[PDB]
Amino acid sequence: HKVDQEFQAAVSKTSWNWLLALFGGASSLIAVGLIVLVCSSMLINTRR
Amino acid sequence: ESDKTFPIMLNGQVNGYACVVGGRLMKPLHVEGKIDNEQLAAVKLKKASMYDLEYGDVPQNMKSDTLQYTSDKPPGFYNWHHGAVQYENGRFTVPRGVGGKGDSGRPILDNRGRVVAIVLGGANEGTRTALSVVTWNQKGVTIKDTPEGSEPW
Amino acid sequence: ESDKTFPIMLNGQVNGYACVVGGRLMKPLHVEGKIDNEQLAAVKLKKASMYDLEYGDVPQNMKSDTLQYTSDKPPGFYNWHHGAVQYENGRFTVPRGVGGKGDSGRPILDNRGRVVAIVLGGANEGTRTALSVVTWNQKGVTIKDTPEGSEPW
Numbered sequence: 001h002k003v004d005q006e007f008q009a010a011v012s013k014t015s016w017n018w019l020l021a022l023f024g025g026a027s028s029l030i031a032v033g034l035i036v037l038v039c040s041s042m043l044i045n046t047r048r
Numbered sequence: 049e050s051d052k053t054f055p056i057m058l059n060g061q062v063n064g065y066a067c068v069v070g071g072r073l074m075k076p077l078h079v080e081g082k083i084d085n086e087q088l089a090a091v092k093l094k095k096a097s098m099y100d101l102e103y104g105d106v107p108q109n110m111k112s113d114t115l116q117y118t119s120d121k122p123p124g125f126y127n128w129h130h131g132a133v134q135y136e137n138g139r140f141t142v143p144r145g146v147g148g149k150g151d152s153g154r155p156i157l158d159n160r161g162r163v164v165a166i167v168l169g170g171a172n173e174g175t176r177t178a179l180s181v182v183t184w185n186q187k188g189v190t191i192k193d194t195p196e197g198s199e200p201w
Numbered sequence: 202e203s204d205k206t207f208p209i210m211l212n213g214q215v216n217g218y219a220c221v222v223g224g225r226l227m228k229p230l231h232v233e234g235k236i237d238n239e240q241l242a243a244v245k246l247k248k249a250s251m252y253d254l255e256y257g258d259v260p261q262n263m264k265s266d267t268l269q270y271t272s273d274k275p276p277g278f279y280n281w282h283h284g285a286v287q288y289e290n291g292r293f294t295v296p297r298g299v300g301g302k303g304d305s306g307r308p309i310l311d312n313r314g315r316v317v318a319i320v321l322g323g324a325n326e327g328t329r330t331a332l333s334v335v336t337w338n339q340k341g342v343t344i345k346d347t348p349e350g351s352e353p354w
Contacts, residue, residue, distance in 0.1 A: 047191075105349075108326045108349065110326065111326060111327060112327035112328050112329040112330070112331060113327045113328050
């Protein structure tokens with residue numbers, strides 16, 4: 001072989017697709033709970 | 049009167065009290081022990097630790113005996129377990145150093161036979177004892193009021 | 202009252218009642234039997250399975266003797282077949298041990314005698330039973346309500 005497998009490219013775009021897809025969604029709500037906390041707290045501070 | 053409300057018990061201390069309002073048991077969360085009305089202990093609680101309170105639906109067999117809360121909070125006297133409290137400047141205020149620790153979960157009642165709020169514990173600047181308490185917004189928003197540095201009772 | 206409403210007979214055993222309001226005839230769906238009015242018994246009824254209620258129309262001669270209902274619905278005391286009945290906080294109540302099975306379809310009337318609710322059933326408990334009943338929105342749109350653990354009568 002005249003080349004060595006750069007792991008950054010060993011995953012095909014068609015396969016790397018799933019990695020870059022599933023690693024995003026898992027985090028999708030990590031901040032949303034705190035966002036809801038902020039919203040409810042500022043609503044209280046607006047009405048308290 | 050308040051006999052439709054009951055003490056939580058631990059170590060032999062009436063370490064707090066609890067109220068049946070709107071068909072839900074309410075008790076302070078920071079206070080642990082046996083609620084003296086043993087039927088209330090069959091209820092499984094849900095918690096609101098930011099409010100330091102927890103609640104659960106009281107059994108139907110006596111749920112119609114529950115007290116009911118108010119939207120009304122005009123300034124003035126309200127009947128309390130230690131006689132009355134003066135609601136003023138939009139705050140529950142008590143004479144400097146009266147009542148106190150042991151009253152967690154004690155209700156404060158509308159003269160019409162309704163409950164205006166539930167106390168958590170007090171503070172005092174000197175002029176008056178300031179009360180930390182959970183109350184109600186005119187549209188039913190439950191809101192905890194707590195003067196700064198308020199101690200648990 | 203019983204002057205403008207009729208019982209339902211099952212095998213000649215009374216098991217409920219039917220009420221005419223605005224000339225519309227209403228009957229509790231779970232009360233198997235026939236309305237005790239042969240001039241009405243020929244009516245054809247439409248039903249509301251979510252309301253457990255079905256309805257029809259009275260003959261043109263008796264349109265004048267129908268009840269009428271309104272949504273003004275002030276809080277507090279009301280009258281019932283067994284006398285005093287009460288409503289507040291979105292619940293209708295009557296002392297424990299009155300009503301129950303075989304007594305659904307009963308109307309609730311204001312001082313003016315205007316009807317505001319008709320009984321579907323309820324839960325028997327504590328000081329006051331928790332009635333399950335049909336009512337109306339402030340705008341007069343019907344609403345049927347069933348407190349937790351209520352049962353049809």
